[PDB]
Design a protein around this ligand. Structure first.
Ligand SMILES: CCCCCCCCO[C@@H]1O[C@H](CO)[C@@H](O)[C@H](O)[C@H]1O
Length: 277
């Protein structure tokens, strides 16, 4: 069906209201002021099997993606005091970075029925999956993180004759933010009693959630669609960059150092400093 409800507690309360209501409306013919006692009549829920079927997290709008401030990893010099161009090698190095995700339910689906669902941050591309989860019934905040260590081998840099180059390594970072909808299909029933008072009979009851709404609002398995909301924000290490600057011309050229495998091992490049050809 097309319809979807954002508060399961409202439905549960209607079912109870209806139960109390019909109990009194039946007596109305005998006692014309019976409805005026609506507040005095007790209803005692005893159990339920309310369940949220197939809870899942769905993106609600496209993620927004912003580059964050670059992480400065280090600086080095490579000096060619020779009359021709030379292949000079940088030192190998490591750097560490933590990928994070935080996720918060902003609008529950009502408190009465517990459910959780997994969320994988989208537009990942790091090769390390980052998952958390959402609670349907509480406004919780779930975090997760993964520490990544980069092993970057020596790089080969062609330096022109009589030139020192300065090399800077830095790590780009992306922030992926957005909203989600928490969806599922509620089934089940509450049971209990309006207890007997004086001459008034006990009414042992069982009401389903699908009975508290119009027949059009139901799916073909009898369930009702529910929806909550949440959001997320993940920080991901992205591209390892090396900028090489020619100290004679002060021109700077940019290179990406690609990943080799998986601890993340990077490739060893052969790169031209500015001033070569
Ligand atoms: C080819 C690129 C060379 C640029 C010089 C990079 C040297 C960085 O070196 C790294 O610095 C880290 C701090 O950021 C330290 O934690 C590591 O131990 C060290 O290996």
């Amino acid at each position: 069906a097309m319809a979807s409800y954002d508060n399961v507690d409202t439905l549960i309360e209607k079912g109870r209201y209806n139960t109390k209501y019909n109990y009194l409306k039946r007596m109305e013919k005998y006692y014309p002021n019976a409805m005026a006692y609506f507040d005095k009549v007790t209803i005692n829920p005893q159990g339920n099997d309310f369940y949220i079927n197939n809870p899942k997290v769905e993106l609600d709008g496209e993620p927004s993606m912003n580059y964050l401030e670059d992480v400065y990893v280090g600086k080095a010099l490579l000096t060619n005091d020779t009359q021709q161009e030379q292949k000079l090698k940088s030192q190998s190095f490591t750097c560490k970075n933590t990928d994070t995700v935080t996720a918060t339910t902003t609008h529950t689906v009502g408190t009465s029925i517990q459910a959780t669902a997994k969320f994988t941050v989208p537009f990942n591309e790091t090769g390390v999956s980052l998952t958390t989860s959402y609670s349907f019934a509480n406004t919780n905040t779930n975090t997760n993180s993964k520490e990544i260590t980069a092993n970057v081998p020596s790089q080969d840099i062609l330096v022109p004759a009589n030139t020192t180059v300065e090399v800077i390594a830095y790590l780009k970072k992306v922030n992926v933010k957005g909203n989600v909808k928490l969806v599922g299909q509620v089934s089940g029933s509450e049971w209990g009693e309006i207890p007997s008072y004086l001459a008034f009979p006990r009414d042992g009851y069982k009401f389903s959630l699908s009975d508290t709404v119009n027949k059009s609002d139901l799916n073909e398995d009898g369930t009702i669609n529910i929806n909550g909301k949440g959001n997320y924000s993940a920080v991901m290490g992205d591209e390892l960059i090396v900028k090489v600057r020619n100290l004679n011309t002060n021109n700077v050229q940019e290179y990406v150092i690609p990943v080799d495998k998986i601890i993340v091992k990077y490739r060893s490049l052969s790169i031209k400093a500015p001033g070569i050809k």
